[PDB]
Amino acid sequence: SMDTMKVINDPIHGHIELHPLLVRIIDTPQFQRLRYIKQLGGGYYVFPGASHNRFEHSLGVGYLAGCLVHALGEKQPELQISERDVLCVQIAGLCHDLGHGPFSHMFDGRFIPLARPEVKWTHEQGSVMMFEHLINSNGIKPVMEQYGLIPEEDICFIKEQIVGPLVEDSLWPYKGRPENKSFLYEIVSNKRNGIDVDKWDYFARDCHHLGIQNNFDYKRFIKFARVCEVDNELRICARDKEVGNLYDMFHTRNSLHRRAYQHKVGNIIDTMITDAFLKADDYIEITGAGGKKYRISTAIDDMEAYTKLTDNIFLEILYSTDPKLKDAREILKQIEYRNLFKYVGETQPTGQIKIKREDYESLPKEVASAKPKVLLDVKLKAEDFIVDVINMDYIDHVSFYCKTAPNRAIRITFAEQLIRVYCKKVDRKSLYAARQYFVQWCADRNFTKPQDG
Amino acid sequence: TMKVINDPIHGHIELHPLLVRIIDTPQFQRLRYIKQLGGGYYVFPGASHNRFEHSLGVGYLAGCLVHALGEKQPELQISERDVLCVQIAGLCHDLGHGPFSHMFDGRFIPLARPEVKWTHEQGSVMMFEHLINSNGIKPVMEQYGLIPEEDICFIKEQIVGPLESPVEDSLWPYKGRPENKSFLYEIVSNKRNGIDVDKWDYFARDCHHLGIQNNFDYKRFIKFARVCEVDNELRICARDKEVGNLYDMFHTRNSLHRRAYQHKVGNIIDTMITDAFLKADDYIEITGAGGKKYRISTAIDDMEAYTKLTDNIFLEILYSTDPKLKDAREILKQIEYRNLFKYVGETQPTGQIKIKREDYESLPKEVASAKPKVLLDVKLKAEDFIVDVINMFAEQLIRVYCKKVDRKSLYAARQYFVQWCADRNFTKPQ
Amino acid sequence: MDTMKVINDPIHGHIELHPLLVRIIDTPQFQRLRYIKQLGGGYYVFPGASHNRFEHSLGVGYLAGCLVHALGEKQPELQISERDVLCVQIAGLCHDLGHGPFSHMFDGRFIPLARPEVKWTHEQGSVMMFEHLINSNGIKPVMEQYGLIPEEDICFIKEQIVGPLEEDSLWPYKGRPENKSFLYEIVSNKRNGIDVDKWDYFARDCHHLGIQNNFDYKRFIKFARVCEVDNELRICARDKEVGNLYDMFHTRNSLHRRAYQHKVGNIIDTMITDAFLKADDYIEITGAGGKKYRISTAIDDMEAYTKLTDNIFLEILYSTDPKLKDAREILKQIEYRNLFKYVGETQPTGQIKIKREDYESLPKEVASAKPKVLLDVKLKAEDFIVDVINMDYIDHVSFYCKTAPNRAIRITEKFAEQLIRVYCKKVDRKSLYAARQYFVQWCADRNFTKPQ
Amino acid sequence: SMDTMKVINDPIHGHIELHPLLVRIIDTPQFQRLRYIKQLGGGYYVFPGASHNRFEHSLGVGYLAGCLVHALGEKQPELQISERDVLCVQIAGLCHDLGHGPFSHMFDGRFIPLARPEVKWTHEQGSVMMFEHLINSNGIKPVMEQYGLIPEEDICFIKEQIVGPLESPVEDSLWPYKGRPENKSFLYEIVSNKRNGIDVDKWDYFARDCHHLGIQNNFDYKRFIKFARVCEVDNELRICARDKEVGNLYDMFHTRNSLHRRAYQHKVGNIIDTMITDAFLKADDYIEITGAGGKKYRISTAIDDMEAYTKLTDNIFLEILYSTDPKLKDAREILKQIEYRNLFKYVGETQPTGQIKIKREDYESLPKEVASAKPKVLLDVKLKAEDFIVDVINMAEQLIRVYCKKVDRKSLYAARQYFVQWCADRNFTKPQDGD
Ligand SMILES: Nc1nc2c(ncn2COCCNC(=O)CCCCNC(=O)c2cc3cc(Br)ccc3c(Br)c2O)c(=O)[nH]1
Ligand SMILES: Nc1nc2c(ncn2COCCNC(=O)CCCCNC(=O)c2cc3cc(Br)ccc3c(Br)c2O)c(=O)[nH]1
Ligand SMILES: Nc1nc2c(ncn2COCCNC(=O)CCCCNC(=O)c2cc3cc(Br)ccc3c(Br)c2O)c(=O)[nH]1
């Protein structure tokens, strides 16, 4: 007794039972912070239903993580899955997104690169740092001990699930659990086949809020799921008949990626918000540890300050009166009036090296420096250009099993990067010149000839 | 020109460009920062949705219904001008909502300024006028066939009703349209029978976000809806068998009202947010016309300040550093750790007694002033009490929470409460 | 009686029925289907397989309506009328009106063994039984009450059930013109295995057998359209919908592999047929003008065939006539679970497939096979059953990409097409061994696959 | 000699393992008989998916009886549940419905009371009779001994589970049963239970009738099994569960309700049942069923000889419908009416106020007294008893519906007049229909 599981009523998963340890981790300012970070960032300004935040999705990931590890233990007891392992996997699923910043992938994937090109920051490292901070700012280690967890090993295990291994030895890299349980590291985030409960939840939830049909049935997948040995390595395998379900999922994956995550106006609005943040970064102060004041771009260095870095920043800019924020405020005002940056074109580095984040800040200048062979009336500044780099995760690298051979696999034996360009000046002459500069840049970088007309 | 918005309930929503000019304004975009169900989100993780989505949906349904009635019955002389006016009324019916929606006008303003008569509908008319004038949309109305005089009046009357100044007589009160088009006033806001497209949309959307089943089919009602004469009066009526659909609606409505809108913990959290606001109202500054500083409780007096009053205030309190807001900040912190006010009991006023908003502030003190008819010991302060008034079309509930959580403090609270119910001749709590 | 009646089915919820369909259903000719088990003798293997042809027929008519109406609303260009909808619904209702006792057992084994000279199919029986239903009741005037033109519309319904009633490369059908060709693909379709008949009985046999079925027929109907292929209007699907189709074909395999081809199930079917054959001379079914028929000849008179039903089984089982003791005894073996014994399975792979007209000769050929080593026991034809199990069989289906809505996408399983099983009526070890020797030698003489 | 476990695939319970002894009992004519008796009687003619028969249900009850008795024996070794006891309970479960006649409850609940009012016949009595006939017509007693049972006391135990205390002594509270002592009293509660209404029979037919009717079922029977106990109350061992599982209990009672209103008390359904009974009655004089020693019996007396009763099943229905004998045309026409959907017409419903229950011995008299009721408002058509059907629907609680075989408007108005007055003469609830 002492404590009790609690029921949360979610529109995707229904009744969610939660072990009291998970509840103690949820009822913390560090976790509740996720109620104020919209899942799809600026997608909301394009899809009215995309009001949802990382908090809901995180609960869903935790629930799905628990369901799947429990099913594998029930079906295959030989794996030695313990209730402790279950709890650790649920905690990892709950906290995999603790580190996101205002407007989710906008922050670590565009803003920090443009604000601090020398820094290498990702939301996953942020999640591990935030998790540590949540453990220590509240009293979570003794509760872990109260429910059987070994904080040293299990904290390591949870963090390793979130960010990966600490290494070319080809020996077992992880230390939080041994290699005999390697498959548990494939539950919350899987890079091999991209089948994890994180994508299950955000595929379902983003379809629910976007009005997209989703025919993937994750409960049916969990039911017919099983661990099997493929290439002397224990992996999560799927029943041979379940391929149809997997088709339905990958089609959902494409429909979400093409219709939403790569929405032209959605991404333009993301970069407009990034422009405001940059034009506000020097004047916005966030109080962190020891009273020290951090900026939007440096909050990630102090978890106490980052705990208060949220979509709120947007309205903190929009509602301000300080003349120093006038620049930033005005950009957000254009978003409200729907006077957006205008789309110039799209290209891909097909065949070429991929653009790195450290070079994002240099791209506008390159574009403005491109010399069209037809000399132009209007001349444009690097400040007049936005260069948007869109990366994508990524038929079947999924391990299967035969209905009678559940121990071994069957043995069966789009793009990685887009580059769009937007212009801040909107007169037809300026936009014509933008296109000229842009085509010439794609030729200079040996990128694919844009074909927008 | 024609913009398409993809909504999860209605699918593709086309918007006449005039409606779009009205949407792309700070006064309307403001609704993106006011959660539909207020504090319900803190109980239902799926209730992340805001008045903005709902408003677009209401506008779409208003248009669908008036256009369908115009096609079936051309003799009504419904014009595209009328359609646009009804759509604008649907779009803007909730412009006047405040932080956390019904929390603001139904508890906060009453407790902060008991003398004031403020409702979100009046607020909607004020915001609507302010939206009209701060952007240049009157000439756009003229550009798309509307007559701003008559039509502005018609829209505001759809939102708030007639300018209450009659001779309380049985004559025709509205001024924006004639009585021969009386049915147009029944689309966005009703109250005669409590069927309007506002309810259609927020029933469907709140069910979609709460995980509740909804088999009311608003599209089929529109199909079988027509105008007919009831007591020499034009009203929107439905074919007889559509009764089956409407039953499905009231069961949906009841299912929403008990399961979500009257949730024990949700409403406790609602009063905790209200308590934070009250304890912050003196120190939070909101700038309005001419730089003048308003408080949370006085933004409703200046629409330029009110345009910036939203759920943001919650985080402005939570993230603050002013020691004077520590009181308020701490309450919001208490919500995060889930250390909520405690539920003491529930009662109702008998007969047709209804507690008015102007009296809400006195209720805690009455409880603290009640002497348990059986003399005891522990004595509690009125500040230690919260009294929540929950409304339902005609009926009214009264719950009581205690801010102190000591096993003894709550035992004593339950007594102040039973005695209070006795003193005011209310129903004996269970 | 004019009103839309509502029926509750476990597969499909509320089934609304146009009064014309109800007048067709409330006839003895249609109610006959309540007394013919869907999976025949499979009930004696699957205790949940109590269902009959009646529930299934209601379902097929319902799905016909669902689909044809969806297409007509999504593509008004097709000129689909409510008359068209009804014709397709009636065809769906009556597509199985011709089945006999124990469904495919009767036309697929019994009639070929009892009357090899005859060519009888349950579809021919459906068209016959339908004509009889129309005329024995007042159906034609009711059709006129609801817009049908009985002349050509009856032709259209029959053509949906049996195929081109009766040769060049032109449009063989006469009930509808070629611009309506897609209507002939709803109830029965051959090119691919996508029709509402198979939809309903896939879902219903799974429901009664305990098999999981993941095919969502409502999804398919919602995303179906009419597209051009080669130069033929035909039913097409979304590219997106391929995942659903996988599940459907998987259901097909699971039904065929563990129900329709169940070993003991088919054994019991042949036992029932053996009884019927041993009873055909002595069982009387009264038909038109009071003439008397037998099980094997009731198909020649729809008035008698109306009364030819699974009931035959119990009329035999409960009989006292000594002339029928032979037949009765076989059925009692079924009740005692003393069944014919399985000997082996083979396939005519690479050979011409066995035709029905030859079924009667198969026992005897097996008994005439000369094993290399001679056995103690000698076995007679009557001691052998030769079960020929035919089936209709990756993507022979047409799709449309979202933006190419009237053009196929251009695509420029592990199941035989005939099985041959042999059982022995003698059940002692020595005779069963003998049977195996006879069976393999027959397989060698016929150059059939070498048995297990 | 030594055999094997036999696996059957059921849609409700899945893979069902059956001890070879149970299979020896199942592979008999007396048991296979149940494949030809529909579970819901005439409800199939209203619910097209209700094609299921007593056979699959019987298998299900035998299976669940085994599951539960085994769970109790495993968690509570103190109760001394033996594998012999398990088998006895499984056989009771299998054979609890061996006695049903054509169309299940239609036969013993209406047909027999109308055709032989003096006789007291219930399907449970029939089950015990058919079970004895099954044992002796086949070689079951030696097989029973082959697998450990003591036929003498164990056959008694199985019968006692099916019908109850096989006798009626003058001993108050003392143990009436003789197949097992009082320290195993709870075994008599698994298959059949009347003290609170929870037994594996109702588990199976609740879930199966929901499956085939399209009704939703919220009861999880194996969570009950997992959380079931035997405990002492009033110095009496009883099957009890865990308080947290109460949520499951309520879920089942809603199913009990949802099934009883929507299916077991369907208006058109019960009407069709009375029409079938009317056919049987108008045919009872002319249909022959051969029984023991070659004697010939009728539908109404086949219950007097288990050998003929083995051959009395829903087939009767079609034997009438397919007949040519003119003596049977009267019955045949009624069944043909069913096929054309020209059914008896509903007049009204009432209940016997207070704790009154019409007894079966009186069913035959009910149409007749109805016809003599003097409707105060003198009317046109005079209706006779034969024109009236009085359906007694039991489930305490009893409904009395009345139907008229004449269908013209005038006769139906007259019929309602007779019916309202009858309710008054009997002091029954005022027919609150007012159609
Ligand atoms: N207005 C409004 N729409 C809203 C809202 N919320 C969801 N949506 C629905 O839209 C989502 C995106 N598509 C739009 O059409 C809206 C953005 C328009 C931005 N401004 C322009 O000038 C413009 C730019 C384009 C760029 C491209 Br590449 C292609 C067509 C374009 C067209 Br068309 C334009 O008009 C809301 O709050 N307001
Ligand atoms: N800790 C935390 N919880 C959070 C947060 N956000 C949402 N929730 C969920 O809790 C709010 C209450 N849940 C509901 O109302 C569900 C709606 C349906 C009706 N259910 C109940 O009436 C109800 C049932 C219970 C059963 C058990 Br067993 C234990 C406690 C129960 C409570 Br409490 C109940 O209210 C968050 O941030 N933190
Ligand atoms: N008993 C029953 N089973 C039923 C019912 N309804 C569905 N099922 C289940 O259907 C599956 C078929 N069951 C059979 O018993 C088929 C018996 C005919 C022979 N074929 C065999 O495969 C078989 C061969 C054996 C050879 C030897 Br040496 C020893 C034991 C054997 C056993 Br055991 C066998 O099964 C129902 O009413 N009664």
Ligand SMILES: Nc1nc2c(ncn2COCCNC(=O)CCCCNC(=O)c2cc3cc(Br)ccc3c(Br)c2O)c(=O)[nH]1
């Ligand atoms: N012509 C002809 N008709 C035939 C034949 N065989 C069958 N039928 C069909 O008619 C049978 C008589 N039906 C009626 O009189 C009307 C039934 C009234 C409903 N009763 C229910 O219990 C019931 C209630 C529900 C409530 C809700 Br909320 C949701 C779902 C429900 C469902 Br689903 C229900 O089932 C045949 O051979 N011929």
Ligand SMILES: [Fe+3]
């Ligand atoms: Fe995630």
Ligand SMILES: [Fe+3]
């Ligand atoms: Fe509203």
Ligand SMILES: [Fe+3]
């Ligand atoms: Fe069929």
Ligand SMILES: [Fe+3]
């Ligand atoms: Fe039973």
